[PDB]
C-alpha cells in the first residue's frame, strides 16, 4: 500500500511542476493585456456605425465620406428588412 | 467473523459508488505527455503574442492603413441594396393579392345549368337548395 | 464639386466613381429623411405567420 | 486480505479524482483549444496593424486580407448609382406600407 501511493504522488508532482513553469509568465502579463485589448476593441467598434500612396490617401478621403453617409442613411433594422424579401415572395405564390 | 464480513460489504459498496462518479476519468490513456507538450507551446505563443500586442498598442494604437475602409463600405452598401429591394417587393405583393381576390369575387361563369353566375352566388343558391331540402325532411 | 472625368485615358477613375457614389448617397439620405424618419420596419414574424 | 485490496483501490481512485482538473488529458485538452483560438486571433490583429491604425486615426499596396473588399467595391458602387431612381421611388412608397398591409389582410 505505501509503495503504491508513493508512486502515484510522484507522478502527480512531476505533472504539476511542468505546468507551473509555463503558466507563471502568462498570469503575470494578463491584466495589462486585457485592459489594452478592451480599450482597443471599443475604439475600433465606434468607427463601424501620381504616386500610388498618394492615390490611396486621396481615395481614403472620399471613402471616409462614404462611410459617414452610409452610417447616417442606414436604419437600425436595415438588416432585418433585407431578410424579409424571400418570405414576401412565398406568400404571393401560395395565394 | 461476523465483523469482518460486515466490513467487506461496506468497503465494496463505497468503491462501487466512487467508480460511478469517475466514469469520465476512466477513458483512453492518450499519452498525457503529448498533451502537456502541446499546451506548453500554446501558452508560450500566447504569452509572446500578448506581449507583441501590448507593444503595438502602446506604440501605434493608444502596408497602407486602407483595408478596413474598403470592408466597411462594401458590407454597408450591400445591406442597403437588399433592404430597399425588400420594401419594394412588399408593396408589389400586397397589391397583387388584392387584385386576385377581387377578380375571383366579381368573375361570372357558367358553373351548372343554363344560368351565368359568380362563384358566391352559385354557392349561395346551392346552400339554399339544401337548406330547403333539410327543412322539408324535419317537418316529416 | 471639383470631380474629374469618370473615364480618364480610356480607364475608370475609381475616385470619381466614389465621389458619384457619395452624391447618390446624399440624395438617398435626403429622401430617407423626408419619407422614412423613423425607419420602416417590415415585421418578418408577421409575414411568416 | 480482501478488504485490504479493496481499500487500496478506493484510496487510489480518490486520489485520481481530486487531481483530475489539472492532470487528466481531457481537461487539459480543453484548455489547449481555448488558448489556440486566441492565438490565431492575435496573429490576425498584428498582421492588419496598419489598416487598423488608419481607421482609428480617421500593384496597389493593400494588405492581402482586404483584397476582396477592395476588388468588389467598384461593381457595387456602379450598381448603386445606376439604380438610384428606383431606390428613391421605393423610399417614397414607405409611408403607404401600413395601408398596403391592411388591404392585403382584408
From Swiss-Prot, chain A:
Q: Which domain of life is it from?
A: Eukaryota
UniProt keywords (A-Z) are:
Cell cycle, Cell division, Coiled coil, Cytoplasm, Cytoskeleton, Microtubule, Mitosis
Cellular location of this protein? Cytoplasm; Cytoplasm, Cytoskeleton, Microtubule organizing center, Centrosome; Cytoplasm, Cytoskeleton, Spindle; Cytoplasm, Cytoskeleton, Spindle pole
Q: Name one GO biological process term.
A: cell division
Primary localization? cytoplasm
Calcium as UniProt keyword: no
Query: Has UniProt tagged this entry with the keyword Cytoplasm?
Result: yes
Signal sequence, start to end: none
Gene Ontology cellular-component terms for this entry are: centrosome; cytoplasm; HAUS complex; mitotic spindle microtubule; spindle pole
Task: Describe the protein's quaternary organization and the partners it interacts with.
Answer: Component of the HAUS augmin-like complex. The complex interacts with the gamma-tubulin ring complex and this interaction is required for spindle assembly. Associates with microtubules. The interaction with microtubules is strong during mitosis, while it is weak or absent during interphase. It is unclear whether this interaction is direct or indirect.
**Function description:** Contributes to mitotic spindle assembly, maintenance of centrosome integrity and completion of cytokinesis as part of the HAUS augmin-like complex.
Family of the protein in this entry:
Belongs to the HAUS8 family.
- For this entry, the protein name equals HAUS augmin-like complex subunit 8
Q: Which organism is it from?
A: Xenopus laevis
Residue window of the full protein shown? 211 to 315 of 367
